[PDB]
Short mmCIF file of C-alpha atoms in Angstrom, two decimals:
data_model
loop_
_atom_site.label_atom_id
_atom_site.label_comp_id
_atom_site.label_asym_id
_atom_site.label_seq_id
_atom_site.Cartn_x
_atom_site.Cartn_y
_atom_site.Cartn_z
CA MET A 1 -4.60 -19.66 -27.32
CA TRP A 2 -3.16 -16.86 -25.18
CA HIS A 3 -5.60 -16.89 -22.26
CA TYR A 4 -4.22 -13.88 -20.39
CA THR A 5 -4.61 -13.73 -16.62
CA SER A 6 -5.48 -11.26 -13.85
CA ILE A 7 -6.21 -10.82 -10.15
CA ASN A 8 -9.82 -10.30 -9.10
CA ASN A 9 -10.37 -8.88 -5.61
CA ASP A 10 -12.92 -6.43 -4.22
CA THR A 11 -11.45 -2.94 -3.91
CA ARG A 12 -14.26 -1.34 -1.92
CA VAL A 13 -14.81 -4.14 0.59
CA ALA A 14 -11.15 -3.87 1.59
CA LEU A 15 -11.42 -0.18 2.49
CA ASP A 16 -13.61 -0.30 5.59
CA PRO A 17 -11.64 0.28 8.79
CA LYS A 18 -11.71 -2.16 11.71
CA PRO A 19 -14.47 -1.96 14.31
CA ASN A 20 -11.96 -1.08 17.02
CA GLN A 21 -9.88 1.12 14.73
CA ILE A 22 -12.86 3.01 13.30
CA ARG A 23 -12.46 5.11 16.44
CA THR A 24 -8.93 6.08 15.45
CA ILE A 25 -9.39 7.08 11.83
CA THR A 26 -12.26 9.50 12.41
CA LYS A 27 -12.03 11.91 15.33
CA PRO A 28 -8.50 11.33 16.60
CA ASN A 29 -7.26 12.68 13.28
CA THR A 30 -6.69 15.91 15.21
CA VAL A 31 -3.22 14.74 16.20
CA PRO A 32 -1.95 14.71 12.62
CA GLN A 33 -2.49 17.73 10.37
CA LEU A 34 -3.53 16.43 6.95
CA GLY A 35 -1.24 17.96 4.34
CA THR A 36 -0.80 15.37 1.60
CA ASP A 37 -3.73 12.99 1.92
CA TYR A 38 -6.40 15.15 0.29
CA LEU A 39 -6.01 16.48 -3.25
CA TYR A 40 -6.30 20.15 -4.17
CA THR A 41 -5.45 21.97 -7.39
CA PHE A 42 -6.48 25.49 -8.39
CA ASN A 43 -7.10 26.77 -11.92
CA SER A 44 -7.76 30.35 -12.99
CA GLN A 45 -10.05 28.99 -15.71
CA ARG A 46 -11.77 30.54 -14.18
CA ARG A 47 -12.76 29.30 -11.91
CA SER A 48 -12.02 25.81 -10.58
CA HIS A 49 -11.90 24.68 -6.95
CA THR A 50 -11.31 20.93 -7.20
CA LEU A 51 -10.92 20.09 -3.52
CA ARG A 52 -11.31 16.33 -3.24
CA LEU A 53 -10.99 14.23 -0.08
CA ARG B 1 8.54 -2.26 14.01
CA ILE B 2 10.34 -5.46 14.95
CA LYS B 3 11.58 -7.96 12.38
CA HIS B 4 11.80 -11.65 13.31
CA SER B 5 14.05 -14.50 12.22
CA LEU B 6 12.64 -17.97 12.82
CA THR B 7 14.45 -21.29 13.15
CA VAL B 8 13.61 -24.97 12.77
CA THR B 9 14.75 -26.17 16.19
CA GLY B 10 13.86 -25.46 19.82
CA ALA B 11 13.24 -26.91 23.27
CA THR B 12 9.53 -27.69 23.01
CA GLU B 13 7.45 -30.46 21.43
CA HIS B 14 4.34 -29.85 19.33
CA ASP B 15 1.77 -32.45 18.29
CA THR B 16 -1.57 -32.04 16.52
CA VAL B 17 -2.23 -28.33 17.06
CA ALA B 18 -4.87 -25.83 15.95
CA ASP B 19 -4.92 -23.96 12.64
CA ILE B 20 -4.66 -20.40 13.92
CA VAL B 21 -6.81 -18.63 11.33
CA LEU B 22 -6.53 -14.97 10.37
CA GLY B 23 -8.26 -12.72 7.83
CA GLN B 24 -9.17 -9.14 6.92
CA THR B 25 -6.14 -6.89 6.45
CA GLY B 26 -7.88 -3.60 5.72
CA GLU B 27 -6.59 -0.94 3.33
CA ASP B 28 -5.74 1.70 5.93
CA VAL B 29 -3.19 -0.16 8.06
CA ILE B 30 -1.76 -2.58 5.50
CA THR B 31 -1.52 -1.45 1.89
CA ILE B 32 -0.50 -4.07 -0.67
CA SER B 33 1.16 -2.99 -3.92
CA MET B 34 3.85 -4.07 -6.38
CA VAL B 35 6.15 -3.10 -9.18
CA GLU B 36 8.44 -2.60 -7.62
CA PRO B 37 9.73 0.94 -7.17
CA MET B 38 13.46 1.14 -6.48
CA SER B 39 16.10 3.65 -5.37
CA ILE B 40 19.49 4.08 -7.04
CA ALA B 41 21.84 6.97 -7.77
CA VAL B 42 22.27 9.39 -10.67
CA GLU B 43 25.04 8.34 -13.05
CA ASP B 44 23.98 4.71 -12.69
CA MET B 45 20.92 5.49 -14.80
CA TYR B 46 23.24 5.62 -17.81
CA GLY B 47 25.46 2.63 -18.54
CA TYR B 48 25.93 -0.11 -21.13
CA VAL B 49 27.84 -3.30 -21.92
CA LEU B 50 29.55 -3.83 -25.28
CA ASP B 51 29.87 -7.26 -26.88
CA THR B 52 32.36 -8.47 -29.48
CA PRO B 53 32.10 -10.96 -32.34
#
């Protein structure tokens, strides 16, 4: 009798922006300049262009 | 981002009030994680304590 435990909570449902913040996180992303958010690595396999938002 | 410090006394009187309900955090504004990650020095990574019979 070990009965291990865990936390169960939707991980997709808690991604959707707010209805009055959905404005902010879409177009007004012109103020910031990306940089670190998206993932990009390059291999001379070649070739590999794994650009992933 | 202001921190608050609340007390148990005041100059007002409350009786039978509402239950101020809140929900939906989002994952963009408020991210919830845990380990926790910490920040120390360099030499402090390496130390020990010797016992004696």
